[PDB]
Design a protein around this ligand. Structure first.
Ligand SMILES: O=C(O)Cc1c(Cl)sc2ccc(Cl)cc12
Ligand SMILES: O=C(O)Cc1c(Cl)sc2ccc(Cl)cc12
Lengths: 331, 331
């Protein structure tokens, strides 16, 4: 029922958006079909973890009358597609960042449309909901937060706009929090609470802390996999070393390497050269970073498991949905 | 007083946005100063016609108590900077469209921040205004409209996503309406009405029609200047011919050229080659398009002058501000 409902609502949102373009925006069929294909290409195919989290949160909060239920679950699905479309928008923007060219014009246009669609679907489906303004404001603030996170990320290896000054655990956590944790972990949880009209019934502090911790757990595992998981298993080519990213491996290595090992890391980091990437990997391996990875994740897991209990004392149904979100990350 | 007030409010908005980043978003001074410079580079230096239109509309509607006045004029300035920042965002996106590259990453990031800033400044300055929701919805709808206009523009010379099928006056007007007229002419006028709480006191039909007509007048003159005004006088290098744009010159020429002249236009349009661009210019000159330009603009001017009178019958103060907006275009 969750996935089936989520896909049924996608068809509903898509038909609304496309009929609106045809009826109110003067769009010709060739362009409508082009946008149907583009929307399917960019919004479908993933795991829908962000979107499905909204549904899971709402169902927990209404179970713990069928007129309110049907409405809350539909609202949860629209909110879920708002986050999936926001994610689709970020992926398009990232694809331009890693590239009279009409393909680049179309990618920029696609990025703008996908973001505009999050507002169009909200303004329509939640038109007479009293939560519309708060939902829009929290969504916009989270989107802004992500752009700020991207600035921190993209400029991590620079400043005074090659320096390893910002290669610290505190800065790594700043990047993860802003760039990923707010829209991936916090926003789905918050949206599920908004639609359920149960936003003031939860300790936001513990929830924000949980979102940041789960985001941190996810990114550390993501960083390790980028470097060590082979492309056929990973589903992409890992480029963090070449890109000179402020990764968990890089910041952890710099705190435990010797002066000559740091000098060796500095001379080989941020290069496309196969042997320099391999030298970096050798340094991570020899510094027993994969042993430290196990313990770091376990300590984060202990903190997550503890905070869910504090949340469960005042918000039991919500804590079980935060538990399922965690199980999807801990997997 | 208008420009002085507008610039004073810019300093206020800038300091709010930058202090918010420093205090609430964990931003380091080097990045705050970088964003201050980027905001100044992208948002300042223009004529502020869109932003100043908001101020001019508000002042007409409150003159025709100092507590309501001071508030309405400040609100007009924030709305004006929302449109100027929206314009700054479109220009950045256009600059990416005409281009581990950190400069491209930063331009994409700049585009996202400038748009997010329109929401951040609205959510703060209008936090307890009853018009906040309507303002956000009308602004978002206009932004979406512009992205749709960009799709029509960028794909005008294509379809089934080189065809001159879409090189028609009706399609030219569709591009102008969506791509330019809604955010340049309609939005400043609408925002000035919103802040003045005088939105239901005007015939929206005549206003929308005026915005579309002024946008059309502006674009026809802009298209002609792109082709015939030399770069030192124009302030840019005119590239419409090379880019194979659906310009007023191209659509007007195709309706009055002979089969062999159309064949000559088709073989030379959309090329960077100096002699092919010159052949296109020769065709426009020989088809007496600059004679037709004079009459087309005069007919549009007659329609504009007439509709302002209809508007003046029920909304006199507003009509004088629509007259000043028109004088800035007719110049
Ligand atoms: O869905 C993604 O993009 C990344 C992703 C995983 Cl991989 S596991 C997981 C668990 C929860 C959430 Cl919200 C996201 C994710
Ligand atoms: O300001 C611009 O970008 C273009 C522009 C002119 Cl050039 S004259 C004029 C008159 C009114 C408005 Cl709203 C815009 C313009």
């Amino acid at each position: 029922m969750p996935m089936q409902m989520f896909m049924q609502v996608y068809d509903e949102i898509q038909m609304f958006l496309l009929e609106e373009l045809e009826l109110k925006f003067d769009m010709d069929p060739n362009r409508v079909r082009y946008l149907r294909k583009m929307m399917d290409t960019t919004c479908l195919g993933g795991k829908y973890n962000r979107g499905l989290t909204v549904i899971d949160v709402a169902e927990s909060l209404l179970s713990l009358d069928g007129a309110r239920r049907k409405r809350v679950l539909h609202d949860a699905c629209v909110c879920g597609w708002m986050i999936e479309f926001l994610q689709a928008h970020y992926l398009v923007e990232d694809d331009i960042m890693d590239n009279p060219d009409v393909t680049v014009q179309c990618a920029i246009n696609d990025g703008l449309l996908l973001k505009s669609w999050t507002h169009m679907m909200a303004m329509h489906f939640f038109a007479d909901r009293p939560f519309l303004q708060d939902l829009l404001c929290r969504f916009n603030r989270v989107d802004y937060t992500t752009a700020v996170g991207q600035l921190y990320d993209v400029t991590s290896m620079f400043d005074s706009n090659t320096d390893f000054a910002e290669f610290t655990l505190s800065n790594y956590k700043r990047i993860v929090k802003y760039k990923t944790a707010y829209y991936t972990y916090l926003l789905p949880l918050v949206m599920g609470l908004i639609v359920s009209e149960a936003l003031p019934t939860v300790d936001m502090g513990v929830t924000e802390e949980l979102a940041m911790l789960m985001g941190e757990y996810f990114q550390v595992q993501d960083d390790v996999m980028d470097c060590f998981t082979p492309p056929e298993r990973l589903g992409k080519v890992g480029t963090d070393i070449q890109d000179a990213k402020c990764s968990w491996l890089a910041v952890t290595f710099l705190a435990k390497a010797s002066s000559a090992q740091v000098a060796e890391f500095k001379a080989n980091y941020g290069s496309g050269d196969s042997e320099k990437v391999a030298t970096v990997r050798r340094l991570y391996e020899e510094a027993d970073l994969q042993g430290d990875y196990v313990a770091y994740e376990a300590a984060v897991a202990e903190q997550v498991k503890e905070l869910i209990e504090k949340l469960r004392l005042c918000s039991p149904g919500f804590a079980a949905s935060v538990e399922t979100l965690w199980g999807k990350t801990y997997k």
